[PDB]
RNA sequence: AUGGAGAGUUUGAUCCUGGCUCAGGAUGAACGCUGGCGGCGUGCCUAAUACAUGCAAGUCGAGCGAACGGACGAGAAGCUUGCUUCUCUGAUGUUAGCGGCGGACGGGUGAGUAACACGUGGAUAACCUACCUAUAAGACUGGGAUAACUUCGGGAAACCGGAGCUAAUACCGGAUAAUAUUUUGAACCGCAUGGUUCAAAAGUGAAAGACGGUCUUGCUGUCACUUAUAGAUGGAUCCGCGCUGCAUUAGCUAGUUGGUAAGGUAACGGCUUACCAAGGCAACGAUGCAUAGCCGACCUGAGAGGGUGAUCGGCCACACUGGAACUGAGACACGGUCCAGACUCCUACGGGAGGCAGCAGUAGGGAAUCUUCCGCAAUGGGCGAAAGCCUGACGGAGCAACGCCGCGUGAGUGAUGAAGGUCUUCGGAUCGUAAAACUCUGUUAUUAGGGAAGAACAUAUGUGUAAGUAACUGUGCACAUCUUGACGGUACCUAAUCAGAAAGCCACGGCUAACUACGUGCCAGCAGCCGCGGUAAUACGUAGGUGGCAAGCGUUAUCCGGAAUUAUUGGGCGUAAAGCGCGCGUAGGCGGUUUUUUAAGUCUGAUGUGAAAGCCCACGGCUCAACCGUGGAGGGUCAUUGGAAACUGGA
């Protein structure tokens, strides 16, 4: 279905990734539905996330699905909370 | 609710039953010259009524197919 | 070739032979229908029933689609 | 304002016209000579030729029967109490088969396609959509079979046939349940057809269990199941416009154009079929022929333009050739089926088997294009409750100066201008501060130690919290803990030793930077053009010297430039190439003055959109750069909507 998934750019040994929605059929460094924010695992020994919690939620809600890297990228900023929070609220 | 295309044009055929064939005219610009060429373009439209005549400018609007052909339906008559 | 392949040429033979079976009844019990209510018979509504119970079971089989079942049922209702 | 060079060659000389040629940039390049390293890329363009071999699609025991394995541990003493059997229990496990899902993705290729294929902008009151999310309502009651298995039989084989037996979240009946279907009431609404909403009947349509918790003559958690309605996603159709050469291709079409009715499709529709009519298309290029995947982009150019469509991303098409359907949410299906054909292979001659335009690799073709590698550690996908399994996707490694970028092959001092080579006016001049010598350095190299990031996790294990419950287990969420790296002991770092191992290529008459000697003598040869060479060649060949570049330098091929030589920007037609021999005129192009009006062109905004990557600009990260990342800017002949009205158009 619909997937909240990690792209890789970068170049060899210097990964850098872009959080999108994507159909899961869809090639990984192919055809996206939408942008969501950028992971950098080799940046500075420190994981530089950016996130916009907006589309993320929109997503979450409609029932695009995260992988475990990028389900931990929300927990880390939060918005994996956020989610419970207001379906539990619902 | 979204608005289909509607074009004015002169009738240049009615032989056929139920459908008049509408010439649309409009100007291209040449991409080098910048001149403006007229250019027409038949577009065949459902009359029920068999109300249409050669000559007549009219009013049409794009609809579903209706034939192998025809894609416009005809919305009023403004000139005969 | 492929192990899965050569299991998926055995299901479909047993899907194919349930699913003709299925489609013969449907098909054989719209055209008994179909007959009985231009001759006016007796018993015009069973088999009309017995059509549209059929064509239904077939849909949700998905030996044919839904728009498909819609049309065939409208067009025996329509009839009687 | 950021951006624009010319030169040679028609003559005795000249000005002009005019072609030809060159200096530049670019490449998936190839070839010749030569060759140190690193980073980041790129690498069958030709035979959509044929393909040996391995691998590229599985997974699920928490759907199911069955089989294997049989722990823990049951009995007798062979007097062997360490070895024994069936008279048992039989745990963690494992698998052939059934069933579910996947296999329609990912990966490859560009043959076909001149087309709504593609690009861009719209439409669907003519559509469809597994998994995922949300909400609501349910999951009741029965049945008959069949793999595996057992046995028999037929085949060379591939693989079939009979009998018997057996499960399921397999299959089937009935019940109950629709906004679905028919019919009848309304109400409101749009853009023809029509949309929407609310009532009353009629016919008709579902489902399923598994693994756990508990207070266990009944509740319940998770997952699975069914129906209805939405969302998300994906797909389908239609249309405006844009998108290719040839008229020494001018006519084309009869399901053809339209209508009617019916059938058919998710769906509109000649989509199809009867019937009726004679339409439809075409000089605004039909039809035919040739060629071609299209685009984002890419190369060039001051620009306008011109050329192109590798790598990467999007869309399309194809899967030995041709046809067809089946299964399915989705295929008319690369590693599925059936048939026909060609080819290859096996055979007991009866009959069978097969499809690298997946990754490697081989043969062939070619000027020419890589290893039959490692790992699922990362990212992504399938299956599963999950661990996990599968994954030639992908991450890495290998090979190749193929390209781009970076750094080397030493540095300082050095007249004593050594020797030697070359030239010479025999004075000398030049190679040349070059060398040697002396001192110094270690990029690199070599050797020896240390040694990243990339890793997030998932799971499991605690604790808390939220929803729900009688409660619990679970579930979502939050915070802790252990554990996981192919590359790889790689990158990088440190120390020690050593100028030691690390420069070639083309050119030097002019364009065009750089000349002499000798040999040769219209020969041998050179050559992009002007040309050069027939005895004192800066043009041949070699040598010395010099010039231009540098791990490259040259050559060939091809594209843009210069070429204002198709000229919109930006040329011409008295004598240079070029005014039809001349009328009458059709289409088309163009058109006097004023006022009023409109707003199609024009101008000025707003809104949506013109993917990402790239180009450009800025900033940040890699020791720098290349490269990587991020944010802007730009890119329409775009659509929609609001103004202005001089000019063009309309009235
Ligand atoms: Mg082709
Ligand atoms: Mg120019
Ligand atoms: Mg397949
Ligand atoms: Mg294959
Ligand atoms: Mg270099
Ligand atoms: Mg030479
Ligand atoms: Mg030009
Ligand atoms: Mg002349
Ligand atoms: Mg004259
Ligand atoms: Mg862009």
Redo the contacts with the bound molecule.
């Keep these: 279905?619909?997937?909240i998934?990690?792209?890789?750019?970068?170049?060899?040994?210097?990964?850098?990734?872009?959080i999108v929605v994507?159909?899961?059929?869809?090639?990984?460094?192919?055809?996206?539905?939408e942008?969501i924010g950028?992971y950098?695992?080799?940046?500075?020994?420190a994981?530089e996330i950016?996130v916009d919690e907006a589309l993320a939620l929109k997503?979450l809600?409609?029932?695009?699905?995260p992988?475990?890297?990028?389900?931990?990228?929300?927990?880390?900023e939060?918005?994996?909370?956020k989610?419970?929070?207001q379906?539990?609220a619902? | 609710?979204?608005?289909?295309?509607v074009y004015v044009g002169k009738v240049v055929?009615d032989?056929?039953?139920?459908?008049i064939?509408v010439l649309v005219?409009?100007?291209?610009?040449h991409?080098?010259?910048?001149?403006?060429?007229?250019?027409?373009?038949?577009?065949?439209t459902?009359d029920?009524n068999n109300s249409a005549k050669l000559g007549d400018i009219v009013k049409i609007?794009?609809?579903?197919?209706?034939?192998?052909?025809?894609?416009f339906?005809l919305?009023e008559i403004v000139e005969e | 070739?492929?192990?899965?392949?050569?299991?998926?040429?055995?299901?479909?033979?047993?899907?194919?032979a349930?699913?003709?079976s299925?489609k013969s009844a449907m098909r054989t019990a719209v055209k008994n229908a179909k007959t009985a209510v231009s001759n006016n018979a007796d018993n015009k509504?069973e088999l009309?029933?017995l059509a549209?119970?059929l064509?239904?079971?077939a849909?949700?089989?998905?030996?044919?689609?839904?728009?498909?079942?819609?049309?065939?049922?409208?067009?025996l209702?329509?009839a009687n």
């Design positions: 279905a619909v997937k998934r990690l792209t890789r750019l970068g170049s060899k040994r210097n990964p850098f990734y872009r994507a159909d899961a059929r869809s090639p990984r460094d192919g055809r996206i539905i942008q950028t950098n695992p080799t940046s500075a020994n994981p950016k997503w809600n409609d029932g695009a699905k992988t475990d890297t990028v389900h931990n990228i929300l927990s880390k939060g918005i994996m909370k989610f419970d929070e379906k539990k619902k | 609710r979204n608005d289909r295309k055929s032989k056929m039953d139920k459908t064939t005219e409009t100007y291209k610009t991409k080098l010259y910048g001149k403006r060429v007229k250019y027409s373009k038949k577009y065949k459902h029920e609007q794009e609809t579903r197919p209706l034939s192998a052909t025809k894609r339906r919305v | 070739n492929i192990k899965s392949a050569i299991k998926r040429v055995k299901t479909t033979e047993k899907a194919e349930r699913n003709i299925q509504n009309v029933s549209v119970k064509v239904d079971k849909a949700q089989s998905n030996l044919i689609h839904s728009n498909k079942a819609d049309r065939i049922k409208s067009q209702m329509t």
